[model samples]
Target: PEASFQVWNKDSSSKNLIPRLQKIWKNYLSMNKYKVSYKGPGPGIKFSAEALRCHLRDHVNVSMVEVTDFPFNTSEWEGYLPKESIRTKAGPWGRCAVVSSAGSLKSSQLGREIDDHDAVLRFNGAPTANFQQDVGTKTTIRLMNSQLVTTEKRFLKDSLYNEGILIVWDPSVYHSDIPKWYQNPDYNFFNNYKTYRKLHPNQPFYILKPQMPWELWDILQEISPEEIQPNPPSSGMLGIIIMMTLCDQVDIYEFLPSKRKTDVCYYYQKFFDSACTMGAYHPLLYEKNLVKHLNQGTDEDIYLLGKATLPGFRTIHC
Candidate 1:
Protein backbone atom coordinates (compact mmCIF):
# COMPACT_ATOMS: atom_id res chain seq x y z
CA PRO A 1 0.00 0.00 0.00
CA GLU A 2 1.02 3.62 -0.48
CA ALA A 3 1.91 5.84 2.45
CA SER A 4 -1.13 6.88 4.49
CA PHE A 5 -0.65 10.47 3.36
CA GLN A 6 1.55 12.63 1.02
CA VAL A 7 2.41 9.99 -1.51
CA TRP A 8 5.10 11.04 -4.01
CA ASN A 9 3.70 11.14 -7.49
CA LYS A 10 4.85 12.48 -10.89
CA ASP A 11 3.08 15.61 -9.77
CA SER A 12 4.54 15.34 -6.29
CA SER A 13 7.46 17.64 -7.06
CA SER A 14 4.59 19.69 -8.40
CA LYS A 15 5.16 21.79 -11.52
CA ASN A 16 7.92 23.83 -9.88
CA LEU A 17 10.81 21.38 -10.25
CA ILE A 18 12.26 20.26 -13.56
CA PRO A 19 11.59 16.79 -15.01
CA ARG A 20 15.08 15.51 -14.13
CA LEU A 21 14.59 16.06 -10.42
CA GLN A 22 10.97 14.94 -10.46
CA LYS A 23 12.18 11.60 -11.80
CA ILE A 24 14.90 11.48 -9.11
CA TRP A 25 12.40 11.89 -6.26
CA LYS A 26 10.14 9.20 -7.69
CA ASN A 27 13.01 6.76 -8.23
CA TYR A 28 14.17 7.18 -4.65
CA LEU A 29 10.56 6.85 -3.54
CA SER A 30 10.20 3.51 -5.37
CA MET A 31 13.67 2.06 -4.77
CA ASN A 32 13.10 2.17 -1.04
CA LYS A 33 16.79 1.35 -0.73
CA TYR A 34 16.74 1.71 3.02
CA LYS A 35 13.72 -0.58 3.29
CA VAL A 36 11.57 2.23 4.75
CA SER A 37 8.35 0.72 6.06
CA TYR A 38 5.68 2.66 7.88
CA LYS A 39 2.39 1.40 9.39
CA GLY A 40 0.88 4.91 9.76
CA PRO A 41 0.04 7.25 12.65
CA GLY A 42 -0.78 6.15 16.18
CA PRO A 43 -3.86 7.45 18.11
CA GLY A 44 -3.85 10.61 15.95
CA ILE A 45 -2.55 12.98 18.59
CA LYS A 46 -2.08 16.53 17.47
CA PHE A 47 1.57 17.52 16.97
CA SER A 48 1.55 21.29 17.32
CA ALA A 49 4.49 23.56 16.47
CA GLU A 50 5.30 24.26 20.10
CA ALA A 51 4.88 20.58 20.83
CA LEU A 52 7.25 19.77 17.99
CA ARG A 53 9.84 22.19 19.35
CA CYS A 54 9.69 20.60 22.76
CA HIS A 55 9.84 17.12 21.27
CA LEU A 56 13.04 18.02 19.43
CA ARG A 57 14.53 19.64 22.52
CA ASP A 58 13.67 16.79 24.85
CA HIS A 59 14.01 13.82 22.49
CA VAL A 60 16.73 14.43 19.91
CA ASN A 61 19.98 13.38 21.56
CA VAL A 62 22.41 15.90 20.03
CA SER A 63 25.44 14.03 21.31
CA MET A 64 28.78 13.02 19.83
CA VAL A 65 30.46 9.63 19.73
CA GLU A 66 32.58 10.28 22.77
CA VAL A 67 35.77 8.49 23.85
CA THR A 68 33.76 6.76 26.57
CA ASP A 69 31.32 5.10 24.16
CA PHE A 70 31.51 1.31 23.83
CA PRO A 71 33.89 -0.24 21.29
CA PHE A 72 35.41 3.24 21.32
CA ASN A 73 36.42 3.32 24.98
CA THR A 74 39.43 1.22 23.93
CA SER A 75 42.93 2.56 23.21
CA GLU A 76 42.53 2.54 19.44
CA TRP A 77 39.92 5.29 19.77
CA GLU A 78 41.86 7.22 22.43
CA GLY A 79 42.89 10.80 21.53
CA TYR A 80 40.62 10.50 18.50
CA LEU A 81 37.48 11.99 19.98
CA PRO A 82 37.27 15.58 21.12
CA LYS A 83 38.34 16.26 24.71
CA GLU A 84 34.96 17.82 25.45
CA SER A 85 31.67 16.97 23.77
CA ILE A 86 30.05 19.27 21.18
CA ARG A 87 27.49 20.68 23.64
CA THR A 88 30.14 21.24 26.26
CA LYS A 89 32.44 23.15 23.92
CA ALA A 90 30.15 24.72 21.31
CA GLY A 91 26.92 25.38 23.10
CA PRO A 92 25.24 28.32 24.90
CA TRP A 93 24.97 30.90 22.14
CA GLY A 94 22.40 33.70 22.00
CA ARG A 95 21.52 33.95 18.32
CA CYS A 96 22.62 31.53 15.57
CA ALA A 97 22.33 30.82 11.86
CA VAL A 98 21.75 27.53 10.05
CA VAL A 99 22.66 27.91 6.39
CA SER A 100 21.93 25.30 3.77
CA SER A 101 23.70 24.98 0.38
CA ALA A 102 20.47 25.97 -1.36
CA GLY A 103 20.71 27.83 -4.64
CA SER A 104 18.31 30.51 -3.52
CA LEU A 105 21.00 31.70 -1.08
CA LYS A 106 23.25 32.57 -4.00
CA SER A 107 22.47 36.25 -4.40
CA SER A 108 20.43 37.00 -1.28
CA GLN A 109 23.25 39.15 0.21
CA LEU A 110 22.63 37.66 3.64
CA GLY A 111 26.33 37.43 4.59
CA ARG A 112 26.53 40.26 7.10
CA GLU A 113 23.13 39.35 8.48
CA ILE A 114 24.29 35.75 8.80
CA ASP A 115 27.58 36.78 10.39
CA ASP A 116 25.79 38.87 13.01
CA HIS A 117 24.57 35.64 14.66
CA ASP A 118 26.46 34.49 17.73
CA ALA A 119 27.34 31.41 15.69
CA VAL A 120 26.73 30.08 12.19
CA LEU A 121 26.22 26.46 11.14
CA ARG A 122 26.93 25.36 7.58
CA PHE A 123 26.76 22.05 5.71
CA ASN A 124 28.94 19.57 3.77
CA GLY A 125 31.63 21.14 1.58
CA ALA A 126 29.75 24.44 1.40
CA PRO A 127 32.47 27.06 1.60
CA THR A 128 32.19 30.68 2.66
CA ALA A 129 35.12 32.29 0.86
CA ASN A 130 33.96 33.31 -2.64
CA PHE A 131 30.32 33.50 -1.67
CA GLN A 132 30.89 35.40 1.55
CA GLN A 133 28.51 38.03 0.27
CA ASP A 134 25.73 35.44 0.31
CA VAL A 135 26.80 32.74 2.82
CA GLY A 136 29.22 34.59 5.15
CA THR A 137 32.74 33.69 6.32
CA LYS A 138 32.11 32.93 9.95
CA THR A 139 31.61 29.17 10.16
CA THR A 140 31.07 28.16 13.78
CA ILE A 141 30.28 24.59 12.82
CA ARG A 142 30.13 22.48 9.69
CA LEU A 143 27.86 19.43 9.77
CA MET A 144 29.19 17.19 7.03
CA ASN A 145 28.19 13.81 5.63
CA SER A 146 30.40 10.70 5.69
CA GLN A 147 30.58 10.63 1.90
CA LEU A 148 32.85 13.68 1.86
CA VAL A 149 34.92 12.39 4.73
CA THR A 150 35.67 9.02 3.07
CA THR A 151 34.90 9.02 -0.64
CA GLU A 152 35.51 12.58 -1.73
CA LYS A 153 39.05 12.46 -3.19
CA ARG A 154 40.60 15.47 -1.50
CA PHE A 155 38.68 15.53 1.79
CA LEU A 156 41.81 14.58 3.64
CA LYS A 157 44.13 16.99 1.82
CA ASP A 158 41.83 19.95 1.23
CA SER A 159 42.15 23.09 3.33
CA LEU A 160 38.38 23.42 2.97
CA TYR A 161 37.71 20.86 5.72
CA ASN A 162 40.26 22.62 7.88
CA GLU A 163 37.86 25.18 9.36
CA GLY A 164 35.11 25.15 11.98
CA ILE A 165 34.11 22.62 14.65
CA LEU A 166 33.36 19.68 12.37
CA ILE A 167 30.53 17.29 13.17
CA VAL A 168 30.17 14.39 10.75
CA TRP A 169 27.00 12.29 10.45
CA ASP A 170 26.40 9.09 8.49
CA PRO A 171 23.13 7.18 8.19
CA SER A 172 22.54 4.24 10.48
CA VAL A 173 19.58 1.88 10.84
CA TYR A 174 16.24 3.40 11.81
CA HIS A 175 16.70 1.86 15.24
CA SER A 176 19.74 2.85 17.30
CA ASP A 177 22.26 0.14 18.18
CA ILE A 178 25.93 1.05 18.51
CA PRO A 179 27.44 -2.37 17.94
CA LYS A 180 25.35 -2.96 14.83
CA TRP A 181 25.89 0.55 13.48
CA TYR A 182 29.62 0.45 14.22
CA GLN A 183 30.08 -2.69 12.18
CA ASN A 184 27.98 -1.50 9.25
CA PRO A 185 28.10 2.27 8.94
CA ASP A 186 26.51 3.37 5.70
CA TYR A 187 29.74 5.09 4.53
CA ASN A 188 32.47 3.23 6.49
CA PHE A 189 34.18 6.43 7.59
CA PHE A 190 36.08 5.09 10.60
CA ASN A 191 39.50 5.04 8.91
CA ASN A 192 39.05 8.49 7.50
CA TYR A 193 37.91 9.83 10.88
CA LYS A 194 40.91 8.45 12.67
CA THR A 195 43.34 9.69 10.02
CA TYR A 196 41.78 13.12 10.07
CA ARG A 197 41.79 13.13 13.85
CA LYS A 198 45.47 12.21 13.96
CA LEU A 199 46.31 14.79 11.32
CA HIS A 200 44.37 17.64 12.88
CA PRO A 201 44.40 16.86 16.57
CA ASN A 202 43.97 20.45 17.65
CA GLN A 203 41.20 21.19 15.15
CA PRO A 204 38.63 19.13 17.07
CA PHE A 205 36.23 17.07 14.96
CA TYR A 206 33.51 14.69 16.20
CA ILE A 207 31.12 12.16 14.82
CA LEU A 208 27.50 12.66 15.72
CA LYS A 209 26.08 9.88 17.84
CA PRO A 210 24.45 7.26 15.61
CA GLN A 211 21.39 7.35 17.84
CA MET A 212 20.63 11.06 17.46
CA PRO A 213 19.27 11.18 13.90
CA TRP A 214 17.13 8.05 14.32
CA GLU A 215 15.66 9.40 17.54
CA LEU A 216 14.70 12.54 15.67
CA TRP A 217 13.44 10.28 12.87
CA ASP A 218 11.15 8.50 15.28
CA ILE A 219 9.64 11.82 16.29
CA LEU A 220 9.35 12.87 12.66
CA GLN A 221 7.59 9.60 11.90
CA GLU A 222 5.18 9.99 14.79
CA ILE A 223 4.35 13.62 14.17
CA SER A 224 4.44 13.78 10.40
CA PRO A 225 1.12 13.77 8.51
CA GLU A 226 2.50 10.61 6.83
CA GLU A 227 5.48 8.31 6.95
CA ILE A 228 8.47 10.31 5.71
CA GLN A 229 11.28 8.40 4.03
CA PRO A 230 12.99 5.97 6.40
CA ASN A 231 16.31 7.71 5.89
CA PRO A 232 17.91 10.04 8.41
CA PRO A 233 17.24 13.74 8.31
CA SER A 234 19.64 15.83 6.26
CA SER A 235 22.72 17.47 7.79
CA GLY A 236 20.99 20.82 7.26
CA MET A 237 18.12 19.72 9.50
CA LEU A 238 20.47 18.15 12.05
CA GLY A 239 22.55 21.36 12.24
CA ILE A 240 19.44 23.38 13.03
CA ILE A 241 18.50 21.04 15.87
CA ILE A 242 22.06 21.06 17.20
CA MET A 243 22.20 24.86 17.20
CA MET A 244 18.88 24.95 18.98
CA THR A 245 20.41 22.88 21.77
CA LEU A 246 23.16 25.48 22.18
CA CYS A 247 21.80 28.88 21.20
CA ASP A 248 19.14 31.19 22.57
CA GLN A 249 17.52 31.49 19.14
CA VAL A 250 18.37 30.62 15.53
CA ASP A 251 17.82 32.24 12.14
CA ILE A 252 17.94 29.85 9.21
CA TYR A 253 18.37 30.73 5.55
CA GLU A 254 17.14 28.99 2.43
CA PHE A 255 16.28 25.70 4.05
CA LEU A 256 12.93 26.58 2.68
CA PRO A 257 12.75 28.49 -0.61
CA SER A 258 12.33 32.17 -1.19
CA LYS A 259 10.45 33.63 -4.12
CA ARG A 260 13.91 33.25 -5.72
CA LYS A 261 13.62 29.44 -5.50
CA THR A 262 15.03 27.84 -8.59
CA ASP A 263 16.47 24.60 -9.99
CA VAL A 264 20.02 25.61 -9.07
CA CYS A 265 21.43 23.37 -6.35
CA TYR A 266 24.02 25.22 -4.28
CA TYR A 267 25.04 28.80 -3.82
CA TYR A 268 28.61 27.84 -4.70
CA GLN A 269 28.00 25.16 -7.30
CA LYS A 270 26.29 25.00 -10.65
CA PHE A 271 24.23 21.81 -10.22
CA PHE A 272 20.56 22.33 -10.93
CA ASP A 273 18.67 19.60 -9.16
CA SER A 274 15.69 19.85 -6.84
CA ALA A 275 17.02 17.05 -4.63
CA CYS A 276 19.30 19.63 -3.03
CA THR A 277 16.16 21.48 -2.02
CA MET A 278 13.25 19.00 -1.78
CA GLY A 279 15.72 16.13 -1.16
CA ALA A 280 16.17 12.63 -2.54
CA TYR A 281 18.15 10.79 0.16
CA HIS A 282 16.68 12.58 3.16
CA PRO A 283 12.99 13.23 3.95
CA LEU A 284 13.68 16.85 3.02
CA LEU A 285 10.16 17.77 1.94
CA TYR A 286 8.67 16.69 5.25
CA GLU A 287 11.62 18.20 7.11
CA LYS A 288 11.04 21.58 5.47
CA ASN A 289 7.29 21.29 6.10
CA LEU A 290 7.88 20.81 9.82
CA VAL A 291 10.31 23.76 9.80
CA LYS A 292 7.62 25.93 8.25
CA HIS A 293 5.24 24.79 10.97
CA LEU A 294 7.74 25.83 13.64
CA ASN A 295 8.71 29.14 12.05
CA GLN A 296 8.42 32.19 14.33
CA GLY A 297 9.39 34.50 11.49
CA THR A 298 7.00 36.28 9.15
CA ASP A 299 5.94 35.29 5.63
CA GLU A 300 7.79 38.39 4.52
CA ASP A 301 11.01 37.06 5.98
CA ILE A 302 10.76 33.72 4.17
CA TYR A 303 9.60 35.20 0.90
CA LEU A 304 12.18 37.98 0.77
CA LEU A 305 15.33 36.19 1.87
CA GLY A 306 14.31 32.60 2.54
CA LYS A 307 14.99 33.50 6.16
CA ALA A 308 13.05 31.98 9.08
CA THR A 309 13.57 32.26 12.81
CA LEU A 310 13.24 29.55 15.47
CA PRO A 311 13.79 29.34 19.20
CA GLY A 312 16.54 27.40 20.90
CA PHE A 313 15.88 24.45 23.21
CA ARG A 314 16.97 26.26 26.39
CA THR A 315 14.08 28.69 26.01
CA ILE A 316 11.50 25.90 25.79
CA HIS A 317 9.63 25.34 29.05
CA CYS A 318 9.46 21.62 28.57
Candidate 2:
Protein backbone atom coordinates (compact mmCIF):
# COMPACT_ATOMS: atom_id res chain seq x y z
CA PRO A 1 0.00 0.00 0.00
CA GLU A 2 3.06 2.28 0.22
CA ALA A 3 4.43 3.96 -2.91
CA SER A 4 7.81 5.75 -3.18
CA PHE A 5 9.29 8.13 -5.76
CA GLN A 6 12.40 10.34 -6.02
CA VAL A 7 11.53 13.98 -6.47
CA TRP A 8 13.79 16.71 -7.92
CA ASN A 9 14.01 19.06 -4.96
CA LYS A 10 16.87 19.21 -2.48
CA ASP A 11 14.58 19.70 0.50
CA SER A 12 14.04 16.50 2.49
CA SER A 13 10.37 16.46 1.58
CA SER A 14 10.68 16.92 -2.16
CA LYS A 15 7.19 16.06 -3.25
CA ASN A 16 6.43 12.39 -2.74
CA LEU A 17 10.08 11.34 -2.71
CA ILE A 18 10.99 10.78 0.96
CA PRO A 19 7.88 8.81 1.78
CA ARG A 20 8.31 6.87 -1.45
CA LEU A 21 12.01 6.05 -1.06
CA GLN A 22 11.61 5.52 2.68
CA LYS A 23 9.38 2.63 1.77
CA ILE A 24 11.83 1.33 -0.87
CA TRP A 25 15.01 1.52 1.20
CA LYS A 26 13.55 0.46 4.52
CA ASN A 27 14.41 -3.21 4.14
CA TYR A 28 16.36 -3.11 0.87
CA LEU A 29 19.40 -0.90 1.42
CA SER A 30 22.71 -2.74 0.84
CA MET A 31 25.21 -0.30 2.30
CA ASN A 32 25.02 2.14 5.15
CA LYS A 33 27.69 4.23 3.38
CA TYR A 34 25.41 6.76 1.67
CA LYS A 35 22.74 6.76 4.32
CA VAL A 36 19.83 9.11 3.52
CA SER A 37 21.68 12.00 5.12
CA TYR A 38 20.38 15.32 3.90
CA LYS A 39 18.00 18.07 4.80
CA GLY A 40 17.71 21.54 3.30
CA PRO A 41 15.18 24.28 3.97
CA GLY A 42 13.89 21.18 5.80
CA PRO A 43 16.87 18.95 6.70
CA GLY A 44 20.59 18.96 5.89
CA ILE A 45 22.19 16.40 3.66
CA LYS A 46 24.30 16.98 0.57
CA PHE A 47 21.76 15.10 -1.48
CA SER A 48 20.19 16.13 -4.73
CA ALA A 49 17.67 13.96 -6.59
CA GLU A 50 16.50 16.74 -8.92
CA ALA A 51 19.27 16.60 -11.47
CA LEU A 52 19.89 12.89 -10.95
CA ARG A 53 16.43 12.00 -12.18
CA CYS A 54 16.90 14.06 -15.34
CA HIS A 55 20.30 12.51 -15.87
CA LEU A 56 18.78 9.01 -15.73
CA ARG A 57 15.64 9.66 -17.76
CA ASP A 58 18.06 10.93 -20.37
CA HIS A 59 18.41 7.33 -21.50
CA VAL A 60 14.88 5.93 -21.14
CA ASN A 61 11.81 6.46 -19.04
CA VAL A 62 11.06 3.95 -16.28
CA SER A 63 7.88 2.85 -14.49
CA MET A 64 7.00 0.64 -11.51
CA VAL A 65 4.08 -1.78 -11.77
CA GLU A 66 2.20 -3.38 -8.90
CA VAL A 67 2.66 -7.12 -8.90
CA THR A 68 1.85 -8.15 -5.29
CA ASP A 69 -0.13 -6.68 -2.41
CA PHE A 70 2.47 -7.68 0.18
CA PRO A 71 2.74 -4.21 1.70
CA PHE A 72 5.14 -3.73 -1.20
CA ASN A 73 7.95 -1.26 -0.57
CA THR A 74 9.85 0.92 -3.06
CA SER A 75 13.45 0.59 -1.83
CA GLU A 76 12.86 -3.14 -2.07
CA TRP A 77 12.17 -2.54 -5.76
CA GLU A 78 15.29 -0.41 -6.29
CA GLY A 79 17.86 -2.52 -4.43
CA TYR A 80 16.96 -6.09 -5.35
CA LEU A 81 17.33 -6.06 -9.17
CA PRO A 82 21.09 -5.60 -9.71
CA LYS A 83 22.07 -8.30 -7.21
CA GLU A 84 19.80 -10.79 -8.93
CA SER A 85 19.98 -9.87 -12.63
CA ILE A 86 23.58 -8.72 -13.28
CA ARG A 87 26.21 -11.37 -13.93
CA THR A 88 29.86 -10.82 -14.91
CA LYS A 89 29.33 -12.65 -18.20
CA ALA A 90 26.28 -10.59 -19.03
CA GLY A 91 27.79 -7.13 -18.35
CA PRO A 92 30.67 -5.01 -17.20
CA TRP A 93 31.40 -4.87 -13.45
CA GLY A 94 29.56 -1.82 -12.20
CA ARG A 95 29.61 1.55 -13.99
CA CYS A 96 25.99 2.58 -14.20
CA ALA A 97 23.98 5.18 -12.27
CA VAL A 98 20.43 5.18 -10.94
CA VAL A 99 17.65 7.43 -12.26
CA SER A 100 14.07 7.99 -11.18
CA SER A 101 11.01 6.90 -13.16
CA ALA A 102 8.86 9.95 -12.38
CA GLY A 103 10.30 11.41 -15.60
CA SER A 104 11.46 9.56 -18.73
CA LEU A 105 13.52 10.28 -21.80
CA LYS A 106 12.08 10.38 -25.31
CA SER A 107 14.01 8.19 -27.72
CA SER A 108 12.57 7.47 -31.20
CA GLN A 109 14.87 4.65 -32.16
CA LEU A 110 15.15 1.35 -30.30
CA GLY A 111 11.41 0.97 -30.84
CA ARG A 112 8.94 3.69 -29.96
CA GLU A 113 10.66 4.93 -26.76
CA ILE A 114 8.58 6.87 -24.27
CA ASP A 115 6.57 9.33 -26.39
CA ASP A 116 5.47 11.57 -23.57
CA HIS A 117 5.28 15.12 -24.88
CA ASP A 118 5.14 16.35 -21.30
CA ALA A 119 8.40 14.53 -20.70
CA VAL A 120 9.87 16.68 -23.43
CA LEU A 121 8.43 19.81 -21.90
CA ARG A 122 9.67 18.84 -18.45
CA PHE A 123 13.04 17.63 -19.73
CA ASN A 124 14.10 19.84 -22.65
CA GLY A 125 11.36 21.16 -24.92
CA ALA A 126 10.18 24.22 -22.98
CA PRO A 127 10.31 26.22 -19.76
CA THR A 128 13.98 26.24 -18.78
CA ALA A 129 16.41 25.72 -21.67
CA ASN A 130 19.04 24.22 -19.35
CA PHE A 131 16.80 21.32 -18.29
CA GLN A 132 15.79 20.69 -21.90
CA GLN A 133 19.39 20.57 -23.15
CA ASP A 134 20.78 18.37 -20.39
CA VAL A 135 17.85 15.96 -19.93
CA GLY A 136 18.96 13.57 -22.69
CA THR A 137 22.73 14.06 -22.56
CA LYS A 138 24.91 10.96 -22.51
CA THR A 139 28.25 9.77 -23.97
CA THR A 140 26.48 8.50 -27.13
CA ILE A 141 23.52 10.76 -27.78
CA ARG A 142 23.77 12.20 -31.29
CA LEU A 143 23.11 11.94 -34.99
CA MET A 144 24.68 8.96 -36.73
CA ASN A 145 23.38 10.15 -40.05
CA SER A 146 25.58 9.41 -43.08
CA GLN A 147 27.20 12.84 -43.17
CA LEU A 148 28.11 12.67 -39.48
CA VAL A 149 28.80 8.94 -39.17
CA THR A 150 32.54 9.32 -39.20
CA THR A 151 32.41 11.89 -36.44
CA GLU A 152 30.24 9.71 -34.23
CA LYS A 153 32.50 6.67 -34.46
CA ARG A 154 35.21 8.60 -32.67
CA PHE A 155 33.54 8.02 -29.28
CA LEU A 156 34.17 4.26 -29.39
CA LYS A 157 37.88 4.91 -29.22
CA ASP A 158 39.30 4.72 -25.70
CA SER A 159 41.06 8.02 -26.22
CA LEU A 160 38.08 10.00 -27.42
CA TYR A 161 35.36 8.41 -25.32
CA ASN A 162 37.99 8.15 -22.58
CA GLU A 163 37.47 4.54 -21.65
CA GLY A 164 33.87 5.41 -20.91
CA ILE A 165 31.68 2.61 -19.57
CA LEU A 166 27.96 2.09 -18.93
CA ILE A 167 26.16 -0.09 -16.34
CA VAL A 168 22.72 -1.68 -16.45
CA TRP A 169 20.17 -2.53 -13.73
CA ASP A 170 16.53 -3.65 -13.68
CA PRO A 171 14.73 -2.43 -10.51
CA SER A 172 11.39 -4.18 -10.71
CA VAL A 173 11.31 -6.44 -7.61
CA TYR A 174 7.78 -7.76 -8.00
CA HIS A 175 6.33 -10.28 -10.42
CA SER A 176 3.23 -8.71 -11.96
CA ASP A 177 4.12 -5.00 -12.23
CA ILE A 178 6.83 -4.38 -14.84
CA PRO A 179 7.49 -1.72 -17.43
CA LYS A 180 5.91 -2.19 -20.86
CA TRP A 181 9.20 -1.36 -22.55
CA TYR A 182 10.86 -4.49 -21.09
CA GLN A 183 7.96 -6.68 -22.16
CA ASN A 184 8.09 -5.28 -25.69
CA PRO A 185 8.02 -8.49 -27.74
CA ASP A 186 8.69 -6.59 -30.95
CA TYR A 187 11.96 -8.19 -31.97
CA ASN A 188 12.05 -5.92 -35.01
CA PHE A 189 12.76 -2.85 -32.93
CA PHE A 190 16.19 -1.46 -33.81
CA ASN A 191 18.79 -1.33 -31.09
CA ASN A 192 20.16 2.18 -30.59
CA TYR A 193 23.79 1.18 -31.04
CA LYS A 194 23.12 -0.79 -34.21
CA THR A 195 21.08 1.96 -35.82
CA TYR A 196 23.63 4.70 -35.21
CA ARG A 197 26.53 2.54 -36.29
CA LYS A 198 24.86 1.40 -39.51
CA LEU A 199 23.86 4.89 -40.61
CA HIS A 200 26.80 6.92 -39.33
CA PRO A 201 29.62 5.07 -37.70
CA ASN A 202 31.35 8.28 -36.69
CA GLN A 203 28.45 10.39 -35.53
CA PRO A 204 27.03 9.15 -32.21
CA PHE A 205 23.28 9.25 -31.73
CA TYR A 206 21.97 9.58 -28.19
CA ILE A 207 18.47 9.67 -26.82
CA LEU A 208 19.98 12.41 -24.67
CA LYS A 209 22.57 14.71 -26.16
CA PRO A 210 25.83 13.93 -24.35
CA GLN A 211 27.81 16.64 -26.05
CA MET A 212 25.46 19.55 -26.08
CA PRO A 213 28.20 22.09 -25.44
CA TRP A 214 25.71 24.80 -24.85
CA GLU A 215 24.71 23.02 -21.67
CA LEU A 216 27.99 21.28 -20.82
CA TRP A 217 29.93 24.44 -19.96
CA ASP A 218 26.91 25.69 -18.08
CA ILE A 219 26.62 22.46 -16.09
CA LEU A 220 30.30 22.64 -15.26
CA GLN A 221 29.88 26.12 -13.88
CA GLU A 222 26.75 25.25 -11.93
CA ILE A 223 27.98 21.87 -10.72
CA SER A 224 31.53 21.31 -9.49
CA PRO A 225 33.84 22.05 -12.42
CA GLU A 226 36.72 20.11 -10.82
CA GLU A 227 34.62 16.95 -10.37
CA ILE A 228 33.89 16.86 -14.09
CA GLN A 229 36.14 14.55 -16.08
CA PRO A 230 36.48 14.51 -19.83
CA ASN A 231 35.94 10.76 -19.77
CA PRO A 232 34.24 9.63 -16.59
CA PRO A 233 34.76 5.97 -15.75
CA SER A 234 31.29 4.46 -15.49
CA SER A 235 30.33 3.73 -11.87
CA GLY A 236 29.32 0.09 -12.34
CA MET A 237 29.68 -0.84 -8.67
CA LEU A 238 26.97 1.54 -7.57
CA GLY A 239 24.79 0.37 -10.43
CA ILE A 240 24.97 -3.26 -9.32
CA ILE A 241 23.66 -2.40 -5.89
CA ILE A 242 20.76 -0.58 -7.49
CA MET A 243 20.16 -3.36 -10.05
CA MET A 244 20.03 -6.09 -7.41
CA THR A 245 17.26 -4.17 -5.72
CA LEU A 246 15.18 -4.06 -8.88
CA CYS A 247 15.61 -7.73 -9.76
CA ASP A 248 15.20 -9.21 -6.24
CA GLN A 249 11.69 -10.43 -6.89
CA VAL A 250 11.26 -13.82 -8.57
CA ASP A 251 8.11 -12.53 -10.25
CA ILE A 252 8.34 -9.04 -11.82
CA TYR A 253 4.58 -8.59 -12.08
CA GLU A 254 4.56 -7.89 -8.34
CA PHE A 255 5.87 -4.32 -8.81
CA LEU A 256 5.51 -3.16 -12.43
CA PRO A 257 3.04 -0.64 -13.77
CA SER A 258 -0.42 -2.18 -14.21
CA LYS A 259 -1.95 -0.40 -17.22
CA ARG A 260 1.27 -0.32 -19.22
CA LYS A 261 2.05 -3.98 -18.51
CA THR A 262 3.13 -6.40 -21.24
CA ASP A 263 6.29 -8.53 -21.45
CA VAL A 264 9.48 -7.68 -19.55
CA CYS A 265 12.43 -6.79 -21.81
CA TYR A 266 14.44 -4.46 -19.54
CA TYR A 267 13.70 -1.08 -21.11
CA TYR A 268 17.44 -0.53 -21.25
CA GLN A 269 18.39 -3.94 -22.56
CA LYS A 270 21.97 -2.93 -23.36
CA PHE A 271 22.34 -1.17 -20.02
CA PHE A 272 20.80 -4.00 -17.99
CA ASP A 273 22.98 -6.56 -19.76
CA SER A 274 26.06 -4.54 -18.95
CA ALA A 275 25.19 -4.19 -15.25
CA CYS A 276 24.55 -7.92 -14.83
CA THR A 277 28.02 -8.50 -16.21
CA MET A 278 29.54 -7.01 -13.08
CA GLY A 279 27.46 -8.73 -10.43
CA ALA A 280 26.72 -12.38 -11.37
CA TYR A 281 29.08 -13.04 -14.26
CA HIS A 282 32.24 -11.22 -13.16
CA PRO A 283 33.35 -13.99 -10.77
CA LEU A 284 33.07 -16.64 -13.46
CA LEU A 285 35.01 -14.61 -16.02
CA TYR A 286 38.28 -14.22 -14.11
CA GLU A 287 39.05 -17.80 -13.14
CA LYS A 288 41.80 -16.72 -10.78
CA ASN A 289 39.62 -14.12 -9.10
CA LEU A 290 36.76 -16.58 -8.95
CA VAL A 291 38.92 -19.11 -7.10
CA LYS A 292 40.35 -16.41 -4.89
CA HIS A 293 36.93 -15.05 -3.92
CA LEU A 294 35.41 -18.47 -3.48
CA ASN A 295 38.28 -19.70 -1.31
CA GLN A 296 38.12 -16.48 0.68
CA GLY A 297 34.36 -16.85 1.12
CA THR A 298 33.40 -13.19 1.40
CA ASP A 299 29.86 -11.82 1.44
CA GLU A 300 30.53 -10.53 -2.09
CA ASP A 301 29.88 -14.02 -3.33
CA ILE A 302 26.13 -14.22 -2.75
CA TYR A 303 26.24 -17.42 -4.80
CA LEU A 304 27.40 -19.05 -1.57
CA LEU A 305 23.88 -18.31 -0.45
CA GLY A 306 22.80 -20.73 -3.15
CA LYS A 307 23.82 -23.43 -0.70
CA ALA A 308 21.21 -22.03 1.64
CA THR A 309 18.84 -21.88 -1.33
CA LEU A 310 19.02 -25.60 -2.06
CA PRO A 311 18.21 -27.96 0.79
CA GLY A 312 20.56 -30.60 -0.61
CA PHE A 313 23.70 -28.46 -0.75
CA ARG A 314 27.01 -29.59 -2.22
CA THR A 315 29.65 -28.14 -4.49
CA ILE A 316 28.68 -29.98 -7.69
CA HIS A 317 29.99 -27.41 -10.18
CA CYS A 318 33.12 -25.31 -10.10
Query: How good is model 1 by TM-score?
Result: 0.90
Q: Considering every candidate listed, which one attains the maximal lDDT?
A: 1
Worst 10 residues of 1 by lDDT: 5-14
Quote the positional error of residue 96 for candidate 1 in Å.
0.4
What would the per-residue lDDT of candidate 1 be over residues 47-77, giving only the tens digit for each residue?
7778878878887788888777888888877
TM-scores of all predicted structures: 0.90, 0.18
Candidate 2: minimum summed lDDT over ten consecutive residues — where? 306-315
Each candidate's clash count = 0, 90
